[PDB]
Symmetry: D2
Amino acid sequence: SDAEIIQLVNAKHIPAYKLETLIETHERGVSIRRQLLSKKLSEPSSLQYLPYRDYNYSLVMGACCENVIGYMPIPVGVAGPLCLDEKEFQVPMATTEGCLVASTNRGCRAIGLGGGASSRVLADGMTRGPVVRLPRACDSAEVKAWLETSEGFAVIKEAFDSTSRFARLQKLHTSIAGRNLYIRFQSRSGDAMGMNMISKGTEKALSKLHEYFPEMQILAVSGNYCTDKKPAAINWIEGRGKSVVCEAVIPAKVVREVLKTTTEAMIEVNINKNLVGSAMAGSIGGYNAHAANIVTAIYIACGQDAAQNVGSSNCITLMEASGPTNEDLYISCTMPSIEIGTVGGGTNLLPQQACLQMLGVQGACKDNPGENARQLARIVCGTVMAGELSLMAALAAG
Amino acid sequence: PRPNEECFLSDAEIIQLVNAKHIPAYKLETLIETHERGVSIRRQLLSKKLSEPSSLQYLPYRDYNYSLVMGACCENVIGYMPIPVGVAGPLCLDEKEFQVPMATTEGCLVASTNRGCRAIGLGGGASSRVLADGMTRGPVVRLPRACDSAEVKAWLETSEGFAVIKEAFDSTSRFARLQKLHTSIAGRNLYIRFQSRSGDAMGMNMISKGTEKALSKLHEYFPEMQILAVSGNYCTDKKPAAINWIEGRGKSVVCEAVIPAKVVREVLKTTTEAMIEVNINKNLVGSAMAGSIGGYNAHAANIVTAIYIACGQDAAQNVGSSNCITLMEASGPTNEDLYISCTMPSIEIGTVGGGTNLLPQQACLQMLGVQGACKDNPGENARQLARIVCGTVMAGELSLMAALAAG
Amino acid sequence: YKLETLIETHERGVSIRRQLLSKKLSEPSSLQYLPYRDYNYSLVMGACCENVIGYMPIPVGVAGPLCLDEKEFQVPMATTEGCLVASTNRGCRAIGLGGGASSRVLADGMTRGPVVRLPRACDSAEVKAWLETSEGFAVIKEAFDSTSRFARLQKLHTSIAGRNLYIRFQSRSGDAMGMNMISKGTEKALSKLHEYFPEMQILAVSGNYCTDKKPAAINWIEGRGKSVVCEAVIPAKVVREVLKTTTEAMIEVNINKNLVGSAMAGSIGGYNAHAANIVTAIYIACGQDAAQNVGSSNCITLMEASGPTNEDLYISCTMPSIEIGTVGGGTNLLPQQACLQMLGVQGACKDNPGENARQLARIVCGTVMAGELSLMAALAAG
Amino acid sequence: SDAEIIQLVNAKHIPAYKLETLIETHERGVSIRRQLLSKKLSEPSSLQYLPYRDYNYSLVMGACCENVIGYMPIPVGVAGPLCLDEKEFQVPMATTEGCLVASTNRGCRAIGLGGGASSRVLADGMTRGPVVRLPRACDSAEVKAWLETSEGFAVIKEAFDSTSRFARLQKLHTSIAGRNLYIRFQSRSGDAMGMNMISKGTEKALSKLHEYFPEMQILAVSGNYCTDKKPAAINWIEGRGKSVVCEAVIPAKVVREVLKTTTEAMIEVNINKNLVGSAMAGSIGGYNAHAANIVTAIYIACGQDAAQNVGSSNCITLMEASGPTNEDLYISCTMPSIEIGTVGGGTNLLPQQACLQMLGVQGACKDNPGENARQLARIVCGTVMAGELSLMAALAAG
Ligand SMILES: CC(C)c1nc(N(C)S(C)(=O)=O)nc(-c2ccc(F)cc2)c1CC[C@@H](O)C[C@@H](O)CC(=O)O
Ligand SMILES: CC(C)c1nc(N(C)S(C)(=O)=O)nc(-c2ccc(F)cc2)c1CC[C@@H](O)C[C@@H](O)CC(=O)O
Ligand SMILES: CC(C)c1nc(N(C)S(C)(=O)=O)nc(-c2ccc(F)cc2)c1CC[C@@H](O)C[C@@H](O)CC(=O)O
Ligand SMILES: CC(C)c1nc(N(C)S(C)(=O)=O)nc(-c2ccc(F)cc2)c1CC[C@@H](O)C[C@@H](O)CC(=O)O
Ligand SMILES: Nc1ncnc2c1ncn2[C@@H]1O[C@H](COP(=O)(O)OP(=O)(O)O)[C@@H](O)[C@H]1O
Ligand SMILES: Nc1ncnc2c1ncn2[C@@H]1O[C@H](COP(=O)(O)OP(=O)(O)O)[C@@H](O)[C@H]1O
Ligand SMILES: Nc1ncnc2c1ncn2[C@@H]1O[C@H](COP(=O)(O)OP(=O)(O)O)[C@@H](O)[C@H]1O
């Protein structure tokens, strides 16, 4: 009985968050936690409109969230078709911002009428940047030099790669700050975003390094040199996750008819807003109009870590006069740090798997590991370009 | 399936009609009785275009209030995405207790934040202050020459020129109160940063309306001025920028607490000394080595994002809203207690408008006691929400830093 | 270093200091080619340098005439980089043939950004709010301005980091670069603030929030010292004949190097080709603090197609933080005063203080634009 | 004859700079240029105090400066001894800032009394970052991938390495912006700062690349991706020229007696000024008190390119409690991008060679090429640390 389970908890016997570790069902656990919580609110009827029934909590519990009191529905709209690399995509966008999906759809239209967009993945590798300390700067310098010898690296790479199937440690980037040493480990991770995997590899690699340098202190597995979820020039300059570039040419006629402006006006707005304005504002990596809007909408729809829009949104949007008469619009978007995955985390949930299926990238790519994640990154970059096209045209037209 | 001329009806018939008269899918809301069937039909149309027609099987869409969404929050709707909502608390802040809703799919985040809240509560709670409040829009205009743009800048800096602009700006809404103007010249280009409070609304739309009218007025004084774009990226909205870090955008907030040494050992499993050492070398030195502007924290974006999604905020705004510098130092008689503070200069937030107009997110705002407009004191609900965000970020910083220091 | 505190002649003290030093060198004959004789050490001693062992001669070249704001300037440039003066001179030529350049000073105010601490963040917030009120500012201004006839406090920009409070004081300073003057005003203003908030601890008169001699977005965004903009239009014919290239090629190089390249490199304020070269050469020649080229060099160079045929080159250079002065420091020495006289800006402008320093800042911006023009043409031609 | 040269030049409109080729002696050509110039000044007697006589213009002409009208004397002071890596240095500083030499000397004293400082060169390599363009982003991506293959690199390295003896192409860091491709070439350069040498190598390497990709357009030999003389995160994160770290421990007694403060006060000032203050100001690389002051003074004295203090001054100064009682001051300075040389440019002049000799690093190192330049970089970092120590103490003291 609910009432007596509530009475049993209000006897200080069970901590509110320890409900599923007792109640014979998930949804009922959620229901009781809600009742307990309501008594603590200045307005006990607050949760009335927060849904919770008929949701598959099995996949959520012990994997995606804790102290669950329900779920938050985010409207999902569709933008497309997105003509990219000779394929057509119907892009799911979870958002509460009016006109965003419509504007992106218009961008997609202009691209399709232009013969489509092309994209390339330039680099792939998630990172973790721990910070270690030596007794002296002279010692940290010795460690840095050691890590730079082919033998020292092979040893570290062996330890790193030995923690998982996908741990393939690439180049190692190090930076010294006195006796501190920041080490940026970079590795592919199949179709997973890879933070957990890279962390495991990093911990074992640091153990191995410790055998060679017993005086080394592991201060933190993350010394903010990754850099994860904080703006940083290092991600912009070296990339993090997937580095992608996309491009398209919009015929003058399409710019006039679909976008309601001219190539010349677009170019002038892009230079003075996305380049000069961002420069005047002191931006590192924010040379675009609204890439974060598109990245965020797709991330939420596809079960990505939305907090990662911080670095994933880095983007430089470039526009140029093209064609016989210099009236056609050449556009490109370069995104050096798209942190994305199609396996793990929120991608394990069914509704988000549905959005990934819609794009044909759900789960692991059996025949070619990482291909689904790479495809998703290309789709993001292409949709960002469609969004940039549309909003820039609107700003150009006034 | 009836012939098209004969063709409220049958699904297959609407589809056959749609295909034939080539009606775009998004116009379905204005062609079908219920909203739900509108999406149902769009889903069916879409499924035929997918390499795997059964893709949408697990994407929910039934029994959702689309009335509030249509023509306001989203277009081409094919359903909704459920994000798990967890609760962290109580958060003892400014002598009140908050139960904080967090929408996320990252395991252990809610649990970790809850631990942080616990440590704070056992320490006597946290205190916070709103330092500044004002959303911005930074349009770019052009004059024929740099000499002319300089003239405009100087004019905008005279008390009379400003009053004129402020009058035009303020005439657009009750809450539109032009605070100040920061201008910057790049040759003949002139970037003008308009800043104004906006009641309890995040305020982008309102500030934009005010900016357009103010630019019209400015145009009367300088007919040769060309309005290149209502946003010249000088706001700066949704892109990382030093200007938001240095001047603030939306709400600037600071939060602080002192964690007793005993609580650091027992709840956080570490020492004040270890925490301090990790904070300095990760949040300060590490962020400096990585070339960060505004990212002097461990994971403020995780907390900001989770609360934003739960409360109907614009999640894309976590880009600048997440700016934060986390500081830690020895406190107390024995210098063994942990003093901690989080300073967030640019929290873009609102409790009225946008996604906050939807019922499920209004529920999360009600849970915090900040839903909608504050009748008695306009903007107070939005300011309270910003303080809550900064306080929860501090709880999250406390917990994650402890785990990093510890093992 | 106490030699001129004892001995009679300055030149002798230097000879002796050299002798003493000589004993400690692994090559005592090294000082052989370091000059020291016949130099006026009187002005240097106790003002510009200590432990003096001589002087370092830097070649001074001349670029000009620089046609700026309907005047012509012969610009002195101290440098050891070959072709720099020649390249800048070519830039000046192109500008002169284009009808000259125009410039405007947009802002003027040196800064000092001390860091203070309160017991709690709640207290530092209280101090910030007090500082933003008209009465609070008036008293701090009253205190700041009482230290000098030239010190006039313009505004205050404050920033909180928990219980720390960074306060950026900004004030004009006549024709002086103004660091010393602003520091004096800041110390007195902080004393006054302390009377209102006794629990406040003055951690450092400079908390790096000024920001002096370190790259910082704050100087780029708010300006520091003099903010200046310069512009000119170069006729298509002049671009072809003097610069050996086309307007179209120049524009393409400027966008992809100065804008896109600097963006890819993660630059804050470095959207130019080589402004530091010009700033440094003029600073050394004119007795400025050369270490200040760090922020003084901030610059965004922009190029556009201009004219009826859209074949003429429009160019502009915007420099938000030129830290400069024509009185004090190295400007007190005769050789550098000679370079300032050459420009007609030596010493204080008695009638309107600040005018000589403002004129010098315009000259720097104009010369930087001449240098940008020439080097970009050379990069575009290839 | 003097006055007759004037009439001739004015009569044929012979450019002043051409005087060198005209006259015989260098000084007479300078004397005449001054006379010509004086007639054009609002105050003809302006040059009265600008020296020009008895200076060796032979080395300057056609190498260091043009349109010469004299020389500017900068006072040279000495700070030392600087106890670094078990050696003692007498450091020449050219400056007009009062108390700078005195303050730096005090810093040196505290270090000496602490048993000296230790330093290490972490990396060495000057750079040039040209920008090239391909017709499409898909093509620039192809070029990037090609440059990353071991065969493509070897080919480029061969072409680069063939322009000089010291040209040893280390690595390549590439970055795409749509159809633009920025390529950062990095190479050691013996004891020379290396800009000219690296530029030569870059031009030839770009020619070779053009043979493989005929559609590639070389937009500019420097696309600002080097980055030379402009502030940039890339130099901070990847280094440029010499990356150096220096450290020392100052006994508590020495901190009290020589520096007039406490270790605790120093530490508090360093954290809140050099770390937090610089962070609040939005600095990239400026986590120090006044490294630029020391870099500039030494650069001018030693014939370095003073405009390079822009990036050479990047520095992070760190302080912490050390010793048994935790009362001694540990200090370190890390400078990732010291652009320096002991051969070429202004180092070819005698007075500056004198300052380099004073340090024992003048010219090339026959047996260990680059050693003199590396030694000079360590000296700069060590002196910057002495300057940081002293000024921080005075700020801490009040
Ligand atoms: C529905 C959206 C796409 C959006 N749509 C439109 N349009 C008029 S539209 C539907 O035709 O594409 N306009 C703005 C808009 C943007 C800036 C502005 F000043 C006024 C209006 C935004 C606003 C977009 C906002 O999220 C980000 C934007 O602020 C970033 C920036 O440019 O700085
Ligand atoms: C559940 C979360 C809070 C999280 N929790 C924990 N814990 C062990 S916990 C549950 O005690 O708070 N640890 C990490 C973690 C962080 C860094 C690391 F190297 C390994 C693991 C993260 C990871 C959090 C991640 O999203 C952001 C993080 O990457 C930011 C950064 O510090 O750079
Ligand atoms: C005499 C000088 C002005 C100089 N002159 C010339 N010329 C060809 S010139 C005399 O005709 O103006 N070219 C370079 C030069 C510049 C970049 C290059 F890759 C190769 C050569 C420099 C070199 C310039 C150097 O100081 C700064 C420069 O590196 C800044 C940058 O553009 O990144
Ligand atoms: C003679 C010098 C070493 C110098 N010396 C001294 N001293 C008191 S001293 C001679 O004992 O070392 N003090 C300052 C000084 C510094 C900051 C201040 F607010 C007031 C005075 C400077 C000023 C130094 C200046 O060039 C750089 C400095 O501004 C960088 C910064 O700290 O931001
Ligand atoms: N509600 C919407 N949903 C999706 N796309 C939309 C929507 N409204 C406009 N668009 C986009 O804008 C384009 C045309 O816009 P417009 O000329 O305003 O006509 P309309 O809005 O009636 O379709 C469409 O082709 C489509 O890409
Ligand atoms: N599943 C969870 N949901 C919410 N909060 C949790 C959860 N697990 C732990 N916490 C938080 O972390 C704190 C630590 O609890 P636990 O890990 O059981 O260790 P301990 O028993 O040593 O306190 C709890 O007080 C609570 O605030
Ligand atoms: N040694 C120099 N000193 C000063 N200016 C020079 C020098 N050499 C060239 N210049 C400048 O550079 C421009 C180019 O002239 P020059 O070098 O003769 O080449 P060109 O044959 O292309 O005209 C001239 O306008 C002149 O002002």
